[PDB]
Amino acid sequence: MRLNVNPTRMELTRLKKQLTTATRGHKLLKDKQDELMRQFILLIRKNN
Amino acid sequence: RRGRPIKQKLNPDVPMITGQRVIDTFFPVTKGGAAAVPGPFGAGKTVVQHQIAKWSDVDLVVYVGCGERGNEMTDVVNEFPELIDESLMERTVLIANTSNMPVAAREASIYTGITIAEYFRDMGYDVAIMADSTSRWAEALREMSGRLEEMPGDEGYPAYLGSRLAEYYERSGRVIALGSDQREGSITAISAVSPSGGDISEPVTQNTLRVVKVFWGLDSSLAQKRHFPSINWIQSYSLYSTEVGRYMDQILQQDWSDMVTEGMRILQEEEQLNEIVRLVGIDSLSDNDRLTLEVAKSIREDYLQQNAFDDVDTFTSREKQFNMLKVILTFGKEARKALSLGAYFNEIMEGTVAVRERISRSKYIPEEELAKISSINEEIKETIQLIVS
Amino acid sequence: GMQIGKIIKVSGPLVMAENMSEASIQDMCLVGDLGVIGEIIEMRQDVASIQVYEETSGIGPGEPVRSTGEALSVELGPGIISQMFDGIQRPLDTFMEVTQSNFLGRGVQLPALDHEKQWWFEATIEEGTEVSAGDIIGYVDETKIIQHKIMVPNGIKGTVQKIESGSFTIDDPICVIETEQGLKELTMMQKWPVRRGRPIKQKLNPDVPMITGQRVIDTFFPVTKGGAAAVPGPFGAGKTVVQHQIAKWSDVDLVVYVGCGERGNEMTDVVNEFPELIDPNTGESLMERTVLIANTSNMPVAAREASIYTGITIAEYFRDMGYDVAIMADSTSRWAEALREMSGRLEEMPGDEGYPAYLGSRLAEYYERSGRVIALGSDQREGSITAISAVSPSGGDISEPVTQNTLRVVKVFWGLDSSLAQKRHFPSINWIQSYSLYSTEVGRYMDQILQQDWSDMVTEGMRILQEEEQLNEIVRLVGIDSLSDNDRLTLEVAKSIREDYLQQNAFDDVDTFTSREKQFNMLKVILTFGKEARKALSLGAYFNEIMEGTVAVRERISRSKYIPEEELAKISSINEEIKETIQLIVS
Amino acid sequence: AEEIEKTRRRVNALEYMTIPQLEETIYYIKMKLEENERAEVTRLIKVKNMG
Amino acid sequence: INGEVINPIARDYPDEFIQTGISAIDHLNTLVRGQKLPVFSGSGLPHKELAAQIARQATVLDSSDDFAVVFAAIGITFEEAEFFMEDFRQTGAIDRSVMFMNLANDPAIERIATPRMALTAAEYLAYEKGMHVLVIMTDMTNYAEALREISAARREVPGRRGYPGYLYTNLATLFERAGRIRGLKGSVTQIPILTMPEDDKTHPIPDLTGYITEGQIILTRELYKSGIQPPIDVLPSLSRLKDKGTGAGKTREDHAATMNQLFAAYAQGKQAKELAVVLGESALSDIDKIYAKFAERFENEYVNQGFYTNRTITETLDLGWELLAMLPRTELKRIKDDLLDKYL
Amino acid sequence: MALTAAEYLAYEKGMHVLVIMTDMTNYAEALREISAARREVPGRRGYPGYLYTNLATLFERAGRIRGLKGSVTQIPILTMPEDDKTHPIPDLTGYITEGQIILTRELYKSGIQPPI
Amino acid sequence: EYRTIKEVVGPLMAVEKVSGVKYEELIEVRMQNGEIRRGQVLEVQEDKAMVQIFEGTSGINLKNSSVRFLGHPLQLGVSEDMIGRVFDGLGRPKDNGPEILPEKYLDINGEVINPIARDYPDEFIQTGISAIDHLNTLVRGQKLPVFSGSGLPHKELAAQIARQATVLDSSDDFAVVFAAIGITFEEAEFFMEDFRQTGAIDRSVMFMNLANDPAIERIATPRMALTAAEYLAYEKGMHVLVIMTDMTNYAEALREISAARREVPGRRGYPGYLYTNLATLFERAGRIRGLKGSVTQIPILTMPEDDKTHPIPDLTGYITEGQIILTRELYKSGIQPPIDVLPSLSRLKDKGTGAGKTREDHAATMNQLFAAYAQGKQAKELAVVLGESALSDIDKIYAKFAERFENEYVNQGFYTNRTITETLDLGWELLAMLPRTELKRIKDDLLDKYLP
C-alpha cells in the first residue's frame, strides 16, 4: 500500500533519499539486535 | 509598459526592517531588493505582505492586489487609516483588481503599480511594491495565449513567461534618479506566487527564482501546526544574507553574523537528525545531540514562530531580536559546556525548567522592557553553573 | 544518381524542398548552397520534408537540395582497413590532408575510401566459372595482416567472361560477368546501406567460446563467437583497459571499434591509444586489423545514430569473407541519446523515459545482425560477428530502458564495479552480479575439448565465491575468529580464487593473457588445495596448522599466473605438492 | 530482553512497512510523472495542429 | 559565431594542471587545460562567488604565460552582473579578461547569442593569438530558457521535459568548442555554470550537460546551510581528466594517493556519523570516532576555505596530510608506505 | 441562478442569506465538457485555463455591502477527486474561498462526527 | 494497378484517385526497383486511402511506385498439410519444404462465436506437469496463461507442455500450434531443435516471428496461428493446443504501432485498446455446440519488473481464465518448474476433473494439498520472522510439508512426464505426512480407499 503523497518531481527526490536512509538504518538496527542478542545469551546463562 | 529611465542602477545594501523575526534574521531583504513568497493556499503569503506594508521602514507602499479576494482589499483601506507609522494610509497606494474582475486587467495592475512606484522612486523615495499574487497575472497571460491559439511553454503558459517576469523585477531596485540632484531612491519588490498544489517545479515559481534574490518558501505542513510565518528555514534563502550580517554587526556592535550562522547550522543539524530519528531515534541519541534538538526546538518555537495578530508579537525591533536570539544561543552554549564537564542532559533540563519558560515568553516582552530579556543570560549561567556542583 | 530540388522553407532544423519527385524516403541529401547533411523524412506530391543535422543558419529559399540517390551507405573495399571514420563514414585522415584544416568543415564532401590508389588484385577464379553473391573472385593483401577478398556483390548471378591479375584502383573494372541483363563490369568495391542487413545463406548457433584470455571472462562469464556481451562502464573501473584486452587478445580476425557520441577529450584517447595497441601475433599495430569509428558529441545526430549501424555493416562485409569479426561499441547509451533526440525532433509519441517506442526494436535489429552464420557463396564458408557493448546508465542504475532492452537480446553481462576498483581488483568485474547464458554450452564444449570436467570445476569455484558472500556477513557480526574450521577454509579458497585467479594485471607480460590450458591448471590447483585441505579437517587436523604448513605451496599457487605458457608443467606439479604437504601435516 | 523486543519492532516496522511503502510510492510516482509527460505531448500535438 | 567541429584526430590530450586555488577542486576534482568541467549549482547557492573566485585565482604553475579569461553572463540580473564587473575591476582581473554581459531583461535572441559570441572570441584568442583561455559562463539554464522561447515561436513540439528535441546538439555544439589542437600553441578551457531546477540532477539541463562535459562540480544546500564555503560536495563531484593533470612534475607525487584516501575517509566518516545517531555514542569504535571527527574537520577546515582564500596546490596537499594524520597509519590503506614515511 | 437569487434577496430585499451549493465538482466537470467540445487549449487534466477565473465569479459573490443590511454567506460543497486536495478543483477552489472545512475518511471510520 | 501515391509520412502512405477501396483491405506496393511490399488500408475517404506498409516506407519513390488493391483482407491459406511444418509470422514457409496447397483462405481476424452457439470448456488436457494438472487443471477450450519474468524458465516449460500435452483415451486427433512472437534467433532455435528432436513437430504447426521481423508482422503472428488452429479444430475436428510466447513482445509491438500513429496512449503508454486487442485473440479459444474439437490457449508472457499490475499481465488476467505464476523465489531453489500454486488458479478446473476424467479423489486432494501448503508456507514465514520457537510441533510438520511439496511434487524436472495417475498418487504420499485428523477437506470414504 502506497503513502498519501503528491506525484511531484521534488516528492520523488525526497522519498528516494528517505528510502536510502531507511535502508541503511534497517541494517544498523539489525546489527544492534544481533549484538544485544549475543550479549543477552551470556547473561541469560548466568541468570539460569 | 516602459520602465521609467534612470541615471544609474545601484546595489541594494541596506536591509529593510520587516519586524518579522524569521525574515530579518535568516532571509532579509534589502531596500531595493526583490523577494518571492511562493506558497500553497492558506500558507500565509497575503499576511506576510500585510506585515511588510504595515511595519517596514520604506517611505511609500504600493499594494497591488492582482487576481485576489475583494475583502482583502477592503481590509486594507479600512484598517490602514487607523494605524500609525501619522496614518499608515498616508504612505499607501492601492491597485485592486480582484479575482472576478476582468482577467486582462491583472496585467494592467502589475504594470500600473510598478510605474507608480517608479514615479515615487524618482522623487528620491524608498518604495516597497507588493504584488499579490503574480500567478494570477501569469494565469491571465495563460488565458490569452490559449485564446490566441499560441503554442504554450510548460504547463500551458506562454513561452515568454520568463522574459515577462524578468522585465518586471529588473524595474525594481536601488537607483540614482535622473536630474542634477542625483537622488537615490529604491524599489523593493515583494511578490506572492501561488503554485498549483504547492508544487514549485511549476514555471512561475521557477522563472521567478531566477530573477529574484530572496525566496521565502512557505510550507503547508508548518501552517497546519500553526507555525507562522510558515517559512521553510531549510529551503528558503536570501542572497542578501552576507551583506546584511555585516550591516547588522556594525549596528548592534555584536557578532550577529556568527549568531545567525550558528542558528542555521543548528537548524540544519536538526534536519539531519530528524531524518534518522523518525525511524529509530530519541531512545538511543547522544546527549550532545539531544541538546542540539532542544536548541533547534527553542529556535523554532521561541524565535521563528511569531503571530501577526498578537498585540506585542506583531513586530520585533532589531534590539529585541538580537536579545532573544542571544538568550537562546547562550542556553545552548552554557548547556554545551556543562555536558563537557560531566553533567547530564536530564540534569540540565530538569534544572532549567523555570529559565526555559522565561526564554519561551520573551517574544511577549514589551519593547520598553528589553532588560527583562537580556537579564535571562545571567540566570542561564548561574543556574547551569550551579547544577554542575 | 544525384537529384536537385529547391528549398521553399527554412525553419530551424526543418527544411522543405519542392521538385524532389526523383528523390525517395530516407534518402540522404546535401542541403543549400553550402551542402550540409539532411535526410528526407516525408514527401508530399513533390514536396519533401527534410531533417537537417548541421546548422541551417544562413540557408534560405531558392537554394538547391542535392539528393545522393540513396540512403546512408558505406563504401566497402580496399582502403577501408586501418582508417578512422565518423558515423556517416567521413574519412578523418583524408579530411586533414585534402582540407589542410583542423575542422570537419560543413558542406565538405569526401569519399570514404581512396579512389586514386593502386592495388594489386590477385585473381584466383577462372574464366567460364559460374558465380553468385559471395563467391571470391580474387584478393588483395590490404595490410600487413589482413587479406581483402573480393566477393561478387549481392544482385549478381553469372559467368566470369574476362578476369586478369594486375594493378587497379577500386574504381577500375576488374572482372566481366555474363548476367541475365547482358554483360556487367565489377570493380573492387561495393556499396551497402547501413540499415539493411547483409544477407546470408543461414544463421547458426554461436557455440564456440571466444578465447579472450581474460580469466574472469573465459571461465565464469564466457561469450561465444557470434555472441553478444553488455558491459556497464562507470568511471574509474578500468573499462578502457578491459576493452583493449579484448581488442587485442580475442581470436577474431578483425576488430571494428565504434565510438557513438563521445566526449571530445574522451574520444581523443581512443584515437591516440588504439594505434598504440599491438597485435600479439605479428607485433604490428592493432590498427592493421581494425576499422575505427569516432564521433564526438557535437557531430551530426545522424552520424551519431548511424555509428553502430555503419560499424555493423562493415563488420558484416568481413564476416561475409569468412572472417571472425568483433564489434566494440562505446557507448550505446550515447547512441540511444541520439535516438531520443531524433524522436523529439520528429515530434513523436515517446516510449519510456523519452526514448522512442521503437528503442527495443532498434536494439534488437542491431544485435540480431551479429552472430555465427554461413555466408553466401558456393564455398558455404562460416564467419561470425561478436558484439561487445558498453552502456553508461545515467545513475549506474541498470534498471533504465537502454540496458534493460539490450539485456533482452544479448546473453552476456559483465558488471564493472568501481567499488572493486577501489579495493584494487582488476578486471573489476563483479562476479555475483555478472552472468553468461553461454555458460552451460561453453562448459559442454570445454569438457569435450579438454576431456576434463571443466564445467564441474567452474560450478564449484562459483559456489565457493557465493558461499564467501554469506560468510562475510558472519565475519562482520561475530568476528573472523568465531567461524568454524570449515568456514574458515572456504574464506581462504574464495580468497585464492579472487587473488590467484580473477585478478589479472593487463600490463604484465605473462599475466596479460592466459591460455585455456593454463586457465584449467590454475583453477585446478586452487580447488585441489581446497579439496585436500577439507579432507585433512575431516581427519582432526586444525585449520591454523594447515595454513602454517602450506606457506611455500600457497605461494607457488599465487605465482601460477606468471608461469610462462611454454612451461605449464610447473603449474601442474603443484597438485602433487599439495597432497604431499597436507598428508605430512596430518601426521 | 525488552530492549531486544524494542529493536525488533523497529527493524520489522522498517522491513515490512516503511521500506515497502517507500519503494511502492516511488515506483508509482515515476509512472505518474511519465503519464503526465505523455499527456502533455498529446495535447501539444493537437494544439500545434490547430493550424 | 557558430564555430566549427574539430576533426577528432586533430585534438591534443590535455596536459596541464590549472590551479583554481580551491582545494576541493584542485586536489579531488582537478581541472586540466582544455577540459570541460562544469559547476552544477542551484537557486540561492553561491556560484556567483565561486565563479568570481575561480576567475581571480585561475593560474598555471611555473608557466610565466598568463590566462586570458573570457567571461559570459547569460540572462543574469543587474545585481549579479554588477558584482562580477566590480570584482573584475576591484582585483585587476579585468586586465586579463573579456566580458560579455547579458542581462535578464535583454531579448531572448541576444541571450542565445551570448555564449556563441563569447566562444568565438575565445577561439580567436586561443587559436589565432596563441593565448590560453578560460571561459566561464553563467547561467546556462537561462540559455535553455531562451531556446524554449524561440522554439515555441516556430510552433515546435518540445522533447523531454519541455525542451527542444535538439537541445543536446545545441549544448554539445557549445561545450565541445574547448581543448587543445595538435600543432597550435593555445587552448580553450570551459567552466559552464548552471542551476539545476528544484535541485534535480535528473533534469535535462544538468543531465544532458553531464554527458557532454568531462565531470562536474556540485554545490549543495546541505553544505551551504552549515556555512561551508564553497559548498562543494566531493562525493557526487567528478573530474574525468584529473589523472592527466597530476603527480610528479605537475603537482606533487602524493596528489592522487591522498585524493583517493581523503575521498574514502570522508565517506567512512559520514557513515560513522550516522552510526552515532542510530546506535549511539557507545557502539562507536575509537577508530570510528576519529573518522567522525575527520569528516567534520574535512568539511569545516579543508572544504571550507572561504571565497577569498587562494590556496596553492602545496598548501592544499599539506592540509590534506595534516587531516589524514588524525588517523592511524594502519588505516591509510590506499597510500604506499613509501609516501606515508615521506609526508606523515 | 442561485447566486443571482441570493444577491437579490440580500442586497435588494435585505435578508441574511445562506447559500449551500453541492456538489461543485460537478460544475467544474461541465466546464471541462464544453471546454473539450470547443477544443480549446486544455490546461491541467483537460480543465480549461479559465477554471480559476470561472470559479471566482461564483465564490466572490458573497459578503456584505456598506449601508445595506443584508448579507450572503456561502457554503459551497465539493468532493475531492481521489481524495486528492491537489486536484485542480479543490486546489483552485481553496485559492479562492476564505478557508475550508475538510472531512477525512480516517476520522469518519473512527466514528468521529462531524469528521472534520 | 495505381500510379497515384500522393504522400508518405513515416509509416503511413496516402493513395489518391482510388475507387471501391474498402477498410482493412490488403494492398501491394510495387516499388520503382521491382520490390514488393504488402500493406493494409487504415482509412478510406472520398478518393483517398491511408495505408500502412508492413516492411515500412523507406526507399520508396512516390512518382514511380504503384499500388495494387487486392480486394480482400489479410488471409492464411490453410491445410491439413500444415502439420509438421514451420512458418514465419505471415504463414510463409520457413522450413525449405514444398509449397502448401490450400483447401481455402481464411481472414485472420476470424469470426466471433455466437455466445449461444458456444460450448462451455469441458474435459481434461494432461500437460504432464503436476502443479498444473492437479491444482490448476487445464480444460479443453480454456485460456490459461503463464506469467513469468526475465531469466525465468518459461521457454523450458513452454517446450515441456508442447511435447508432453495429450488427451487421454483418444488418438490421434490432438495438435499443438506453436506461436513465437518477437523472440531471438537463439530462443527460436531452441524451440525448433526441441520439437524436431523429441518428435513433437510431427503433431504441430509452428509460426515463428523474430525480434527483428517488422512490428506489424509480430501482431499478425498470433492471428495467423489462431486461424490455423480454428481450421484444424472446427473443420477437421481436432483438439488443438495453442501456445504463444512471449505476449509482452506482442504488446510492445502494438505499442510501437500506436505511437507511430500518435494515438492517445493508455496506462504506461500502451494503446487504449490493448484490452480489446488481446481479447480478440484469447476469445478465439473454446468449444462450439455440435462440433467436435476445441481450441485451447496457453499465452506466455514475462511481467515487466516482476509486476503483475503492469498492463500486460493485468489485462491478460482480466481476459483469461486463471493464471500460472512462475516466481524467482522458487527458481533460485532449483524447483522445476518454478510454479507458485498460491497466486496461480485455474478458473474452469472442475469441468476437467473427477471420475471419468482424472480420478474421483482429484478435487479433494487438491483442496487439501493446497490448504496444507498454505499453512506450511505461513509457518516458514513465521520461523524466519520470529525463530523456530514460535511454532507449535504441528506448525513444524506443516512447514516440513511445504518443503517436500516444493521439492518433490512441484519440482519434477523439465523432462519428466507425469501421468495424472502418477501425480495424484504422489499427492497421497505427501498427505500421509499429516495426521489423518488434520485432513479436514477430505471425507472418510476417500481417506479409507487412498490414504497410504
Ligand SMILES: Nc1ncnc2c1ncn2[C@@H]1O[C@H](COP(=O)(O)OP(=O)(O)NP(=O)(O)O)[C@@H](O)[C@H]1O
Ligand atoms: N503570520 C501569521 N500570523 C498569524 N496567522 C497567520 C499568519 N499567516 C497566516 N496566518 C493564518 O492563515 C490564514 C491564511 O493566510 P493567507 O495570507 O491568507 O494565506 P495565502 O497563502 O495568502 N492563501 P491564498 O491567498 O489562497 O494563496 C490567515 O487568515 C491567518 O489566519
Ligand SMILES: [Mg+2]
Ligand atoms: Mg493570499
